[PDB]
Amino acid sequence: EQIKDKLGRPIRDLRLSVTDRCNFRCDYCMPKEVFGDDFVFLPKNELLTFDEMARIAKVYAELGVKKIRITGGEPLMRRDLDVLIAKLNQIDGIEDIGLTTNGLLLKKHGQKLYDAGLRRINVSLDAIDDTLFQSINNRNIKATTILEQIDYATSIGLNVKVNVVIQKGINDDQIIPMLEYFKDKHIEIRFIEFMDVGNDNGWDFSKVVTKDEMLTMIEQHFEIDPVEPKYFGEVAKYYRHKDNGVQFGLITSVSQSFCSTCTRARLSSDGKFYGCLFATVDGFNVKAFIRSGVTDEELKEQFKALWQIRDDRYSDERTAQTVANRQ
Template sequence: MFRLHLQNLVKRPCRLFSVEAFQNKGNIKVSDQVESPLTDLFGRHHSYLRISLTERCNLRCQYCMPEEGVKLSPHDKILTTDEIIHLAQLFVNEGVTKIRLTGGEPTVRRDLVSIIEKLKQIKGLETVAMTTNGLTLTRQLVDLQRAGLDILNISLDTLKSDKYEFITRRKGWGRAVMGIDLALQLGYNPVKVNCVVMKGFNEEEIVDFVKFTKDRNVDVRFIEYMPFTGNKWDFNKLLSYKEMVEKIKQEFPDFYPLDNGPNDTSKAWKVPTYQGQVGFITSMSEHFCGSCNRLRITADGNLKVCLFGNTEISLRDALRSGCSEDDLVALINAAVKRKKKQHAGMLNLSQMENRPMILIGG
């Protein structure tokens, strides 16, 4: 074992960065299993990095953004394109093979195509993915695909336009569906459709979403409703994975589970003969912390080692203060080694202070 004390974590040129994540924590104990700075104390190697490109969004989804909105970071606090690529290269050097671009809404960032092109030039990076609400894909997706975008997730919580306007506080259902259709036409295989399920809102549409996979090569991923600051999470609105499966089996008794990969967050299911499939992201009822291989960088440059963790460390400040590559790696290593075995559980999470989802990155 070796120790990294906060004051000695990085050399003098890097003393300006924020260390709120580790305040009042004492010394940082780091395992001597140094095969990778991205491997935590529980043996989880983090090969998947999610980078939020912006805090801005053209929707105002209720489960993502507080009703009163959010205070956005000043523009000069958001990572620049060069900083994003610099950090991406650093993480790939240490073993990241997949990067997902999120937001906010990543398509509102004007240099999105350039960011994808530059990411695709990083040797060792196998996959560049993006999560989007799909509203602008009909005019952007061809260029994004040419730039090298490999995987596409499109958020769609209802198949009814009036409900879409209610949950997002904006119009746009038709454009989102056209974005899905265009992605299919361009050969994305499959197109992943993210659907947050809530009792009293869209639970009766679950079967309709399953039918949506009949003639489309889509992977509809039902996401359990999760608590974040300002989204008024209520346990009574949570529809669990098992409840969803039971509802679907009432209509499709032959609905059956598929095999999953070791780091899959989505439990895959399928209706026989249907072209597409269905998945369930069970963060609340059956967490998958033991196989988590994901890290997150927020749009303002903070590293989050857990979606539900409220400790962060500013890579932006470290980078701008002149940290060397070795110092940055040491900082990341220390943060990863502090990752907990699992999150606190849904009821505890609902009481914890965390960023609104829009400020974390989907």
């Protein structure tokens, strides 16, 4: 029931990638140069079905999983996503189901999602200036559009948090406007440090605004009290606006790596297992495993086996290398 990996970390979260498609082409994720006109995405049948996803989640739930986060791609591009949600909403032990999206399709699908049980979403928005944000998504989408979508999602009863990845030299200046806009809207926003491994290969701080620097900027425009961790392994450092009372987080993904508390399992859109967001090599083929015909007991012992040999710790590895890189 509680299974731990080789670093003593229990399994708690399941990340389900639902598609390899996206409606954006953001330079650090799906740059046009690689996913341009030529690129073949997965054939529809090479994706896991909703039934398969639900059966996988049922079994991980028996091994201690309690949260599932839906990702892609842009998840909202996957047709009938609401059916997935309904089926995950029927699984004992799963207490939270989240989704992250760029939000463009929230007016089109939000209600169906909500109807099937979706209550929380994370929206990725890397800027609030329209011209900057188009330079980031590369698909001519205005930030104003996404603001509108966020307000729709809110209006229908979704709780919305925003995630912002900051790259020094690109969206530095988005921090204060975005803090402001979402303080107004009583919405929790979170600024994430950019992860970029140089040639050495430790962390490339060239760009890279750390939590510490970000904080220096913030405190000059807003008056703030830190907010004590709700629980023990909690990733984001939170701070409160004295006003008001509205929270925002800072995610020290590079300056202060958190592999020691990382309880996350991942299934990719092509149905393979990964024990870390980074991975150069193909994972165990869960998809082909279950398609060969297997019992639930068989699946469960395989997921258990996969977690018990997990020792991923990519960021810590980059931190140790970075330190070693001071010869």
